[PDB]
């Protein structure tokens, strides 16, 4: 049983506003053009081994089901773009899923591993930073011991930190600058 | 203005009559032969390019002749002498901006035999001095009489 009180009528418009201006109003507003044909679900590699049904996520958004942001299903999309390529109604499915995940992250529905990844970029500028073994490997291979990346450039690390603070991404992941670690 | 036209205008005013100027464009008075099928321009040449035929209309030969957008009365001595009309008599009574109308006519007939496929960028690229080509004697009376 689904009542009006259990639905959030503006979920579709909310998803569109989160997509304006990135990836774009026209891109995310395409979720309204969906005619529930199921071509996206049939094309989904993840759907063939889980309860994830691409079409139902779009349906749940248009209907206003709040749980879609709390669901584990939206995080099963590998972003292969097959549904995006085959949609007959021009629904930018892959982009809508990513925008819904933004609202999920704001609600606090982020995996610890994904936040650790976001922390490494905020701290070291990279999702997969270099370690003592990296220096040794690069040396034996004939490459520069330390790659010309942000990790070994305080100018670039401080540039990213200024942008991250301005974007509010540090507050999103719950990062404490003084402690140098994530909260919760 | 030709001396006869000056006398005609003054004489009409002395008599009390209202002076009347010729109304047609220059091709009427011009002795050059026109194509019965209509005017068609293939390419645009500058006055020094090639050797013009003395009988054929200079506009059909590819030269910018202002005779089509210029009032008659001079006797068309320029095309008769081997050079295109420069439009020194100005436009007819039915045209305000001579250059604009000359540009309209030139663009319309350029590649008319191949209308759907002719490149619309050949003409603007071929004319490196547009104001000097169409507003020699009338720039101040044009809709846009100055360069901003």
């Amino acid at each position: 049983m689904i009542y009006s009180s259990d639905l959030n009528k503006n979920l579709a418009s909310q998803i569109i506003e989160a997509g304006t201006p990135i990836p774009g109003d026209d891109v995310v507003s395409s979720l309204k053009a969906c005619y529930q044909c199921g071509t996206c679900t049939g094309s989904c590699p993840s759907g063939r081994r889980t309860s994830y049904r691409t079409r139902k996520v779009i349906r749940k958004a248009l209907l206003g089901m709040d749980d879609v942001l709390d669901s584990d299903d939206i995080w099963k999309c590998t972003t292969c773009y097959t549904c995006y390529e085959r949609c007959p109604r021009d629904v930018k499915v892959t982009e809508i899923i990513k925008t819904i995940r933004n609202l999920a992250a704001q609600k606090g529905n982020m995996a610890k591993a994904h936040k650790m990844t976001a922390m490494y970029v905020l701290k070291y500028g990279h999702a997969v930073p270099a370690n003592k073994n990296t220096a040794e490997l690069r040396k034996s291979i004939g490459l520069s011991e330390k790659a010309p990346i942000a990790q070994f450039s305080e100018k670039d690390l401080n540039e990213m930190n200024t942008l991250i603070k301005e974007l509010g991404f540090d507050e999103l992941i719950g990062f404490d600058w003084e402690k140098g670690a994530l909260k919760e | 203005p030709n001396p006869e036209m000056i006398a005609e205008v003054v004489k009409a005013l002395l008599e009390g009559k209202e002076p009347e100027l010729p109304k047609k464009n220059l091709c009427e008075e011009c002795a050059r032969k026109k194509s019965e099928e209509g005017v068609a321009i293939e390419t645009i040449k500058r006055n020094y390019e090639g050797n013009p035929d003395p009988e054929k209309c200079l506009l059909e030969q590819g030269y910018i002749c202002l005779g089509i957008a210029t009032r008659e009365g001079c006797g068309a001595p320029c095309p008769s002498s081997g050079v295109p009309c420069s439009g020194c008599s100005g436009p007819t009574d039915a045209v305000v901006d001579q250059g604009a109308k000359m540009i309209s006519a030139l663009c319309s007939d350029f590649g008319i035999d191949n209308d759907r496929d002719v490149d619309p960028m050949i003409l603007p690229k071929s004319i490196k001095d547009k104001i000097g080509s169409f507003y020699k004697f009338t720039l101040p009376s044009a809709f846009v009489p100055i360069r901003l």
Partner: protein, 138 residues
């Protein structure tokens, strides 16, 4: 404190209908433009655009059928050749090429007309007023 003065010339078969479609669908766009109706874009010639700038237009817009879809078969091909020359003449007269905008919009393209009106308005607003009339009134 200032709003652009834009004049439009639209063909009765396609762009005029395209503008009506935008209206039927309540497709909002800026109120700077004032449209003038002609039967074909082939009716549009340099004299009408230059006259608009003389009168004080900050921007001039022209709309016709898609190339090959003219109600009168080829009127838009003549206008296309005239506008390319006019763009460069405007630059020689110190008028930014961007102050003239010509587009091919059908009777069913209401959304395209709305976005073309929004884009042209934003373009002219950024350029500021055309100071021709002010220079001529001195």
């Amino acid at each position: 404190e200032w709003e652009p003065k834009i004049i439009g010339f639209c063909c009765n078969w396609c762009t005029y209908g395209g503008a009506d479609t935008a209206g039927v669908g309540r497709m909002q766009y800026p109120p700077s433009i004032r449209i003038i109706r002609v039967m074909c874009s082939g009716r549009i010639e340099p004299s009408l655009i230059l006259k608009a700038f003389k009168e004080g237009a900050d921007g001039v817009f022209v709309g016709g059928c898609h190339l090959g879809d003219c109600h009168y078969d080829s009127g838009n091909y003549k206008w296309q050749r005239r506008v390319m020359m006019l763009y460069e003449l405007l630059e020689e007269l110190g008028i930014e090429k961007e102050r003239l905008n010509h587009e091919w919009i059908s009777a069913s393209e209401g959304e395209k007309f709305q976005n073309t009106m929004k884009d042209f308005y934003n373009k002219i607003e950024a350029l500021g007023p055309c100071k021709l009339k002010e220079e001529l009134d001195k």
